[PDB]
Amino acid sequence: SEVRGSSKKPWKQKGTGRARVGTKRNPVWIGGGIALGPKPRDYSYRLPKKVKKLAFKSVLSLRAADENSFKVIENFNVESGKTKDLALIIKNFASFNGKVVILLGNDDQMIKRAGKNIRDLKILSFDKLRVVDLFYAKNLIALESAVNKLNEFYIK
Amino acid sequence: ARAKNGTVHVARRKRILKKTKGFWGTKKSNYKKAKDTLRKGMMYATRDRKVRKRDFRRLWISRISAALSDTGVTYSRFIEGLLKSNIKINRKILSNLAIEDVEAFKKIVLEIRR
Amino acid sequence: MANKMKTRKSAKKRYSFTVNGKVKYKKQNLRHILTKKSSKRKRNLRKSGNLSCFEVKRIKTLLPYG
RNA sequence: GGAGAAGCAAACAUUUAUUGAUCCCAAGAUUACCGAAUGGAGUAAUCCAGCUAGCAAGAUGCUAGCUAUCUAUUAUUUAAAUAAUAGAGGCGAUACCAGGGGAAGUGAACCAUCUAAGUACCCUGAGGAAAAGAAAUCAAAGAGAUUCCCUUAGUAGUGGCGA
RNA sequence: GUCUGUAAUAAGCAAAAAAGUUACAAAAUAUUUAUAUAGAAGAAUAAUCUGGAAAGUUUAACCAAAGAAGGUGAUAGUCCUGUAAUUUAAAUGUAAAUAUCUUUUUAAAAUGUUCCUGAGUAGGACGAGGCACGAGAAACCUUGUUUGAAGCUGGGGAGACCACUCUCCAAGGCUAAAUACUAGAAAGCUACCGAUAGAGAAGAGUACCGUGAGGGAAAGGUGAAAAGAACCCCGGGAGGGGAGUGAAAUAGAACUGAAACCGUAGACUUACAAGCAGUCAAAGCCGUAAUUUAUUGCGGUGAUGGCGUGCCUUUUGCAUAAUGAACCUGCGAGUUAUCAUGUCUAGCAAGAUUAAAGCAUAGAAGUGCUGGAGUCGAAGCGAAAGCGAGUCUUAAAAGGGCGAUUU
RNA sequence: CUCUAGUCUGUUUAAAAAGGCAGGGAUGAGCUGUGAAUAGGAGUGAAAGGCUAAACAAACUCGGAGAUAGCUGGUUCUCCC
RNA sequence: ACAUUACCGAAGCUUUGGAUCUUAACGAAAGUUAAGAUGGUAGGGGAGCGUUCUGUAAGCCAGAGAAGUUAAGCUGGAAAGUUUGAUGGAGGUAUCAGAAGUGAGAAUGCAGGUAUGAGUAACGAAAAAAUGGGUGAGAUUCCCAUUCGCCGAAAACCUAAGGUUUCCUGGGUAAAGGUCGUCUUCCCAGGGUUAGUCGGCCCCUAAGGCAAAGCUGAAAAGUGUAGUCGAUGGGAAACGGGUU
RNA sequence: GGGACUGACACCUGCCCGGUGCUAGUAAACGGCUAAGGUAGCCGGGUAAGUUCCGACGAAUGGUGUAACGAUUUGGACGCUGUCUCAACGUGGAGCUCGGUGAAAUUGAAGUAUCGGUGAAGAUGCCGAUUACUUGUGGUUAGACGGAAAGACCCCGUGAACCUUUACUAUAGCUUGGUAUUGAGAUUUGAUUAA
RNA sequence: UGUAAGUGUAAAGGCAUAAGGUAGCUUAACUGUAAGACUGACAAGUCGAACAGAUACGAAAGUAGGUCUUAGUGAUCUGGC
């Protein structure tokens, strides 16, 4: 019904010697419509908050189980906002040549906009975590501010 | 999300054509005729695999019966004496014996006639 | 909410559900000519009954919410 | 904005551009004829004029500027008649809104009630939103204009109590 | 305040408040690094190896508010254009704010008598429509044909109607925002498409068909660069063969170039035979590997023997002379959105769960909170009132119906 | 110059209704050029259920519309119970 | 026909090798044994292969040769899977998990290419061609010449209705002309239509159309007077000859 | 002027008002012939041999005759003929061969023989038996239940469309009454209410 | 002779203790109900001891919830009393 064209029967029902047909844009015909094709749809849904919380606890435990890949660094800040300094800090810590996720205890805009450009880096605040990033992160670097805020964030 | 890549049908057809190499006429190249002839051929292959046993046993029996035509022992009686004297040799073995080494088979027959 | 399944009103007005599955209903033949019908027949027709277990699945389809 | 440019692609030989081009943007000028087309008429892109100005204007010459109609407001005895300004004509959105007209294919395994459905479509109006909008209201709760959502809820009722 | 002169009040003038988004109307500038419509700046690579070509291999850096996306001879953060964060406004357009300007009040708290407070209107009769509500007990509103009121000591409404009571005050006219819509403009995104796809259209409603209304196709790709094959030979040319360009000319108007179809060459078999063309056995010939070498295998052909009624769909039943296909290659059908119910998985638990929507950060159509209005369980029975582990049928637990105390 | 009884060719024809032979009308209810009027549940019809752009027991185009079908056809990879 | 001893004869039975499932036993379990049980449409349940995209993946594998057909060989119980070559010259992709435009042999299916009939029917009217010469690479089909034949109230000439360069000169033969072609209404370039007396325009009206006003209708309009348009009609003017 | 009916002309055109139309009547109305029972009229010859032909239902949806007329139907006679016994020859366009150009429908394929049988019940594909060197061309269609047209006939589908009716249900139009448009007079026909 | 007669009404199965016939009394031709079943897709249909109230008949025990049994019938919706 949405392909351009007329809805006239291309030829008579009987007597022509051809296969019966109703409209030119028949899904069978070339250039016609498409039967049972894709239509716009809402893929989003919201999980129960308890399940989401339990998943967060589980992934954090799974990451912290390993001593080397999970590390904690004393609070700092990049007051200059440059990228050299942050990159130096990562390349001092991280070892597994891959995704690195930094956890923060606040919204330190300087660090965030200093790290927005590193190669394989993801900066996350404590209250805005993402399970995919945590789960696939091969190096996980947290501040002790982030540790404390996570403690009262998820103890409740 | 269109999922079209047609590297499948050519694969099926290539395997079929590979197995249908020596067939007559258009049955060796066309997809439809090759598939029809191959599928009936495989069923024939199964049936015939079971039939080959019957065919070969029939051949062995006929060969034994031919090798005994000389003497006066009809091979029903030969099988008779064979079992009765407790010689558990095989139809294939006897058939091959009558060709490779006729005198051993003849001695077996002399021994059966008892 | 675009497509909530509609109940079958003519069935709602005649069927009722018990707590664990059975369906309650009012018996027929006590609506009309009644002089000829025997008294014990009428007394049994007055009291309500339960349907056979063979209709319960279809009825549960007819009354999607009740 | 700065070194090329002569459209959308180069070719062939001609110029321009550092005297700031080409190009982009803003504004202005020019802006044939048809077309709501409106001086009349007409087979749309074209014949026929009325009046005024200039072409030696002139014997069916050319150019420029006016004369269409409706409604509101008055210059008058707003009807008649001209005059004066003001607002409209048509197109665009194979979208939205308001008003008017309003089916049929179907379902009810028929059909005539009903359903589909104020649906499609037609017509009249404007807007950027429209319509509606500040209670002689909701409604038995104490609220307080209109409209749009989540719930109430497939509930209350209605229906050849059939769908 | 009919005129003059007094107690006694109006018409103007000090003093203030608003106003082109309704609320009076018509503007005009300055002014706002506000915005729309042209722009500017803009970071950080050398060597080596393969190769025609490096951006790639490898060894070491540097930048990053810029590792968004393209082009660059093979795969670029640092080659070019752009990108982050900033930022060009003479002129034009759109916005507020400030005065100017315009307009208004140049007064209010205060008791009872009279005036008005919206008229063919409210309502009723008949015929219709809209309200979820089809005349049904059918309110109420609009409304065609008729009839027809009260004047706050009032009237309308409270789903027939009556009484009381509680609310409201019509028959005058405006009103932004939240809301619908995107033909399009700019900036972006995609578990969206990659030439039978995607808009019909990568070239367009064109070619073509019909008197007209109208209907409506098919056709993308050389090479990194034309650097388009100088010249020579055959030929009228076309075209091909050489010589050159190029990494390649079975890259020469075209990339990768299959199947259907048409061929050439070599090997084997076939002209005494009745083969759904196949399978099971099998001599000879040819190719090939082993075993000292002509007998066993991998192979291709195959005389001869045995068995065997193509396939699909439809029927009690088909090789059927029932149906369908020229072949080949592409395209071509149980999906999505919600509700009911069952099961599985995950989580909580006599509780479980938020919807709309808001805030914060980000620009990253997220996901972390806020938000409990509502729904499903926790008590059912009875038409209902109502009663409750009991309830209804009944004077009766007197017997049963539906429950439960064992969720 | 206008019409088509009878017969034949043709009938995957030259022609989606002709041609080869013939016949009727041929000063009149005549033929014909050039304009105009009558449009779909309507028109027109010296009247056969004819015609109305080669198809008319209700024209054509677009839209409703992907109308409804108890009817027919089709429905694609594998294995195990 | 009646007796004696047999044999052949099925995917049955028995035996050998291997696999799955149910039950039972053993074993910590994995599994190892015993028993039996597995024809199968409709239809029910369960277990997998393969395709595309997404996260894993700023990962890994590629110009020292990706993807794709393509020859041969090999593995898996089936869907199938991956090694060596030729061709190809630029992107694919492990594991895990998710999502479908997720798998074609047919619907008198759609689209495209190519067989078949078949080098067969036709090559379009029973008006008829023949010779010589010229042009040209090439002539039964072009041009020229001489004969013959056909139409001749035409198959001739001059103007409409229509077509719109098809007209003339020169050059050329991809296609197209039912064959061939030096030729064409084919293609390319250039050239070509001169009006006071012709036909229109114009001044008039037939049928007809529009139509202020008036009248009638939900709208849109329908009727219709005064007027204005509407030729195949009626109205000023020319004939002969020559030239490209 | 409109509609219906009949159909030059000639002789005739009768009976019936129950039913149905029209305004008790009307039939040159629909129709019939108990309402009324239909009035007039409508073997022989031909051939040796003749199911043909010629001569001995129904009255204005007309009956019975009729000169002339007719690309109308049927019978007979004369003349004429290849229509026939009976075919042969000749002419012209195709067909045949070669050269150039070059289709169509159909098409699961095919190293597709026949007879007697069996079988979704008419066999190219099965059984038995028989026949047959391989491959073309020119002829003819017996078969391949040939090709072409989802059989037009039959039947089915709670199919579709059209038409008819004293089928059902609405309605244009027509018609009647009341009311608004719509006033004033005169008079007695009454009803009702009391006096 | 021993049910072939007769059992409102068709036929069958039954009826001597008669369910046949006669006579007296009488209205159980009841209300609320019901353990447990047959027949059955469902909806329906049929038998039913026994309990409470009110009786009828009989001295009482008991019987009586129509007709010897097996056909004499019609859902739902709507409307009336």
PDB file of C-alpha atoms (C1' of nucleotides) in Angstrom, chain E residues 146-147 271-278 308-310 315 317-322 325-327, chain H residues 107-113 119-126 131-134 143-145 180:
ATOM      1  C1'   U E 146     -45.334  25.410  16.225  1.00  0.00           C
ATOM      2  C1'   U E 147     -46.347  27.426  20.907  1.00  0.00           C
ATOM      3  C1'   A E 271      26.145 -48.682 -35.983  1.00  0.00           C
ATOM      4  C1'   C E 272      21.886 -56.866 -33.914  1.00  0.00           C
ATOM      5  C1'   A E 273      19.861 -53.254 -30.634  1.00  0.00           C
ATOM      6  C1'   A E 274      13.912 -52.232 -26.987  1.00  0.00           C
ATOM      7  C1'   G E 275      18.305 -48.498 -20.716  1.00  0.00           C
ATOM      8  C1'   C E 276      12.797 -43.350 -15.965  1.00  0.00           C
ATOM      9  C1'   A E 277      19.087 -43.489 -18.258  1.00  0.00           C
ATOM     10  C1'   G E 278      20.450 -44.936 -12.159  1.00  0.00           C
ATOM     11  C1'   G E 308      14.294 -50.461 -10.637  1.00  0.00           C
ATOM     12  C1'   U E 309       6.686 -47.077 -13.162  1.00  0.00           C
ATOM     13  C1'   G E 310      10.585 -38.775 -12.869  1.00  0.00           C
ATOM     14  C1'   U E 315      -7.059 -38.111  -3.235  1.00  0.00           C
ATOM     15  C1'   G E 317      -6.428 -45.072  -3.933  1.00  0.00           C
ATOM     16  C1'   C E 318      -1.780 -42.379  -9.158  1.00  0.00           C
ATOM     17  C1'   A E 319       3.932 -44.208 -13.621  1.00  0.00           C
ATOM     18  C1'   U E 320      -0.860 -42.884 -14.474  1.00  0.00           C
ATOM     19  C1'   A E 321      -3.740 -40.612 -20.162  1.00  0.00           C
ATOM     20  C1'   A E 322      -5.485 -35.784 -12.534  1.00  0.00           C
ATOM     21  C1'   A E 325       7.227 -26.492 -14.284  1.00  0.00           C
ATOM     22  C1'   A E 326      11.594 -24.534 -21.342  1.00  0.00           C
ATOM     23  C1'   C E 327      16.284 -24.299 -18.693  1.00  0.00           C
TER      24        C E 327
ATOM     25  C1'   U H 107       8.641 -27.884 -24.124  1.00  0.00           C
ATOM     26  C1'   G H 108      10.327 -32.415 -16.457  1.00  0.00           C
ATOM     27  C1'   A H 109      13.678 -34.714 -19.276  1.00  0.00           C
ATOM     28  C1'   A H 110      14.004 -39.291 -24.189  1.00  0.00           C
ATOM     29  C1'   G H 111      20.259 -44.803 -25.955  1.00  0.00           C
ATOM     30  C1'   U H 112      10.186 -43.309 -26.933  1.00  0.00           C
ATOM     31  C1'   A H 113       9.317 -50.792 -30.637  1.00  0.00           C
ATOM     32  C1'   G H 119      -3.119 -51.392 -13.414  1.00  0.00           C
ATOM     33  C1'   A H 120      -6.620 -44.456 -10.722  1.00  0.00           C
ATOM     34  C1'   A H 121     -10.213 -49.327 -14.504  1.00  0.00           C
ATOM     35  C1'   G H 122      -7.955 -46.805 -22.996  1.00  0.00           C
ATOM     36  C1'   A H 123       0.336 -48.223 -21.510  1.00  0.00           C
ATOM     37  C1'   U H 124       6.377 -45.319 -25.274  1.00  0.00           C
ATOM     38  C1'   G H 125       8.282 -46.510 -19.624  1.00  0.00           C
ATOM     39  C1'   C H 126       5.177 -52.834 -15.851  1.00  0.00           C
ATOM     40  C1'   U H 131       9.936 -57.725 -34.083  1.00  0.00           C
ATOM     41  C1'   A H 132      13.948 -54.464 -35.191  1.00  0.00           C
ATOM     42  C1'   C H 133      21.713 -52.619 -38.735  1.00  0.00           C
ATOM     43  C1'   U H 134      22.838 -46.728 -37.557  1.00  0.00           C
ATOM     44  C1'   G H 143      -1.395 -42.215 -30.985  1.00  0.00           C
ATOM     45  C1'   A H 144       1.234 -39.297 -27.338  1.00  0.00           C
ATOM     46  C1'   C H 145      -6.842 -39.178 -23.574  1.00  0.00           C
ATOM     47  C1'   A H 180     -48.175  28.069  10.066  1.00  0.00           C
TER      48        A H 180
END
